[PDB]
Amino acid sequence: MNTYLIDPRKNNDNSGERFTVDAVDITAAAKSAAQQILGEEFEGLVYRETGESNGSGMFQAYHHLHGTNRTETTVGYPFHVMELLEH
């Protein structure tokens, strides 16, 4: 298990409030971070906007638009996910 530091960025109006999630890899962490930022009704995935694959970076959530046959849309703003070592 790894720890990751989340900065919701524009999702919290860039207040500087941050939190951590634990996950086995950074893509799983980014999905957990989106659930925490967007709340329990969010079901979807995330994609990477910055950083090396498998490394720290900005991510953006997306999901199926409710009521539509197949429409996928982004939800929320980008957020940062960073590797963090706890002692």
Could you explain the architecture of this structure?
This protein has one helix at residues 26-38, and strands at 2-7, 19-23, 45-48, 57-64, 72-84. With 87 residues, it is mainly β. It has one domain (2-84). It is classed as viral protein. The entry lists the keywords Anti-CRISPR protein, viral protein.
- Give the overall shape, derived from the CA principal axes: globular
Share in β-strands: 35-45%
Count the beta strands.
Answer: 5
User: Rounded to an integer, what's the Rg over CA atoms?
Assistant: 13 Å
So what's the oligomer here? monomer
How much helical structure, as a percent, in the residues? 10-25%
Main sheet overview: 5 strands, antiparallel
Tally the helices: 1
Note the gap between the termini: 14 Å
How many domains? The number is 1
Strand adjacency order, main sheet: 2-1-5-4-3
Class from secondary-structure proportions: mainly beta
Order of helices and strands: EEHEEE
In short:
By secondary structure, this protein is mainly beta. The protein contains 1 helix and 5 strands; from the N terminus they run E-E-H-E-E-E.
Q: What's the helix and strand layout?
A:
Blueprint lengths: L1 E6 L11 E5 L2 H13 L6 E4 L8 E8 L7 E13 L3
Antiparallel strand pairs: 1-2, 1-5, 3-4, 4-5
Can you give keywords for this protein?
87 residues; mainly beta; 5-stranded antiparallel sheet; 5 strands
